[PDB]
């Protein structure tokens, strides 16, 4: 159709071969928040859409998310996502779309009927780590500079193998979504990437609730359960890795 | 050792036959949050242990649970696991308990440092539907009840097959666990179990955000990553069900 909007984001697949058992791995991480949350805090749907279209969204969300949503305190879902980072005016829209949608209406008995009935639970998916440019910021800059902010492994843990690119085109049918990935190989010890994860590190906790090394069973048995296919990514970078090594 | 205290569980393991891909399939329950956050908010610690010891309770809580704990909002962590259920007298001994370790010793400033450097995150525990046992009540009678009150599935849906009986011990160095499964089969149809789960229905959203169809591959993989290892109960449960199957 007609894009109205190209949306491009640039990020590292970085491998390892596990010395033990001899199988390739590669650094996943797994998002602390759904889609449908974010969407329904930032108001990204239609308050006249019908019933069924917007008890979707609440199926999409996490039990505890949708238990956050039934107690109509927006700052409590606000702070979900944003655990006090200083975005007030964008806050403060938000917040405006969400007290008129519902809270004015009928001071929220529409809202929470929607959330007791919605059924099922959403997935909290799996994901390459990646972002967005920064003005007059190189592809691979930004491959790297997102990496360790997600992450927190620092450039001397891996060497870029500059052969290899992949990217995604995916199509919402006005916004064009193009994911361009690099491949990096591990060069020094990191047995437990989960424990970069703290607090302390705004960032990396930003979005990310897990923080792990996958093998390719693993990458195959979380695609088959989530939105976002992670094989189209993942296979060809695992087949370099073996030709890489091979040689 | 010396048990000083014996705690036992009914549950039930309901299996299906799968007609798509002719794979035996049976019901598993995600637990909603952590051990580690219900013992911390619980209480079941102590405060004199040291400091490494006490980081490795905030270690195994996931990061949503640790940035609740990060707001020193007593209420909005009490609020995550028991969701406005009436137990004021446990909830003010438990908060009292918080107040005096963490509140009036620094206003929470001890607390939010071993916060902020935990590292990692813990993993939300998938399990077979299993409770104790009422008053006078019989151990096939309460895995029923359990069963029913945690996924909404209802006794139309199945039949027990009694010749299936398998217990698991566990020894905690004072407690005794003792979990007693049956073994039912689906004789009704029933593709998305996670559909029951709704927030109108306060015991089945209680401590479960997932209900899935789970395949013995599936089991494994799972098994492997977590501390509750599933396997010694599917694994002779899918046994019986291929013989009952083939008589
Ligand atoms: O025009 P708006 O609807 O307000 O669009 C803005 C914005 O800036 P400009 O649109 O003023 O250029 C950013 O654009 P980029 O950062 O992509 O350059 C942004 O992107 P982010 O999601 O990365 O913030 C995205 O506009 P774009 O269409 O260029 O992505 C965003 O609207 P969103 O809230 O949809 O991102
Ligand atoms: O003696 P307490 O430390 O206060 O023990 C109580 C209780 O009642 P009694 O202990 O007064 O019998 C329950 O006992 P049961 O329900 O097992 O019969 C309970 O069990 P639940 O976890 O199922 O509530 C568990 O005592 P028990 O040692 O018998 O499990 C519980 O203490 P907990 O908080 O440790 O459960």
């Given at each position: ?58 199926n999409n969300?996490?039990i ?54 919605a059924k099922g639970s959403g ?125």
């Open positions: 159709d007609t894009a109205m909007q190209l949306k491009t984001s640039i990020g590292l697949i970085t491998c390892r071969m596990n010395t033990q058992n001899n199988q390739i791995e590669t650094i996943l991480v797994q998002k602390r928040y759904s889609l449908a949350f974010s969407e329904f805090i930032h108001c990204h749907y239609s308050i006249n859409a019908n019933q069924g279209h917007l008890i979707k969204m609440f969300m996490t505890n998310e949708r238990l956050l949503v039934k107690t109509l305190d927006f700052d409590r879902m606000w702070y979900h996502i944003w655990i006090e980072t200083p975005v007030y005016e964008l806050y403060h829209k938000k917040y405006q779309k969400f007290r008129k949608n519902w809270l004015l209406p009928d001071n929220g008995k529409k809202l929470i009927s929607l959330i007791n009935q997935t909290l998916l799996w994901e390459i780590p990646k972002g967005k440019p920064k003005e007059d910021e190189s592809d691979l800059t930004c491959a790297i500079r997102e990496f360790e902010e997600e992450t927190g492994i620092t450039r001397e843990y891996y060497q870029i193998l500059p052969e290899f690119k992949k990217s995604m085109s995916y199509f919402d049918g006005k916004t064009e979504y193009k994911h361009i990935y690099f491949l990096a190989m591990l060069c020094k010890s990191l047995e437990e990437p989960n424990m970069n994860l703290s607090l302390q590190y705004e960032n990396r906790i930003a979005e990310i609730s897990k923080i792990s090394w996958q093998n390719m069973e693993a990458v195959r048995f979380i695609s088959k359960r989530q939105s976002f296919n992670l094989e189209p990514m993942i296979g060809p970078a695992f087949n370099f890795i073996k030709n890489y090594l091979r040689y």
